[PDB]
Design a protein around this ligand. Structure first.
Ligand SMILES: CCOP(=O)(COc1ccc(C[C@H](NC(=O)O[C@H]2CO[C@H]3OCC[C@H]32)[C@H](O)CN(CC(C)C)S(=O)(=O)c2ccc(OC)cc2)cc1)OCC
Lengths: 99, 99
């Protein structure tokens, strides 16, 4: 689809078999989701945002479907203010900016 | 133009008679720029993201040019680690997400 930006670009995603709402975030390098149960291994990671750094759990090669488009990639799970889909997955679904 | 997201979507902006580099950021409600001593009045504000909140100065009705596209709106100025063009200005330049 083509999404304008008068509202937040929130979409429905499916991860771990569960549906959630997430923000398409071209300013995020990585995909960061609020605390949740996900199956499999994980590694402690640190990531930095506008306000400082937080500790997250890094899940690799995770299946995730964004607005009907499949991705398989790294998902960080931790105390983010909102679920953000970052460029690591936006590229997978063929997302570009246009003006 | 069309901007792919393999790398950060960095563009040149002109604000306050100065050229700077900033990210086209669909996850940013507002526009947040590095410390700059703009003229005129301002109002204190706090904005939060990953890692918490930072203190910024809110300037209204500021002229900004983004890849030759003119806009006018609110800019938040403070110790942000990155300059972001948020949705308040991205809508004015006709920017969409597409996949
Ligand atoms: C202290 C750490 O230092 P750092 O690594 C941080 O460098 C950043 C910070 C913020 C952003 C924009 C946001 N991206 C971000 O956090 O990305 C994370 C996730 O992937 C990583 O890549 C970039 C930093 C990781 C996101 O796009 C916008 N945010 C809101 C979103 C989290 C819901 S925001 O910036 O917190 C914000 C903007 C406008 C607002 O108006 C009210 C409110 C809040 C990009 C790069 O840089 C050193 C020079």
């Amino acid at each position: 689809p083509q999404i304008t930006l008068w509202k937040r670009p929130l979409v429905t995603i499916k991860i771990g078999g569960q549906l959630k709402e997430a923000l398409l975030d071209t300013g995020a390098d990585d995909t960061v989701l609020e605390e949740m149960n996900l199956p499999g291994r994980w590694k402690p990671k640190m990531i930095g945002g506008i306000g400082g750094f937080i500790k997250v759990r890094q899940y690799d090669q995770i299946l995730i479907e964004i607005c009907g488009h499949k991705a398989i990639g790294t998902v960080l799970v931790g105390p983010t203010p909102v679920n953000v889909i970052g460029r690591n997955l936006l590229t997978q679904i063929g997302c570009t900016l246009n003006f």
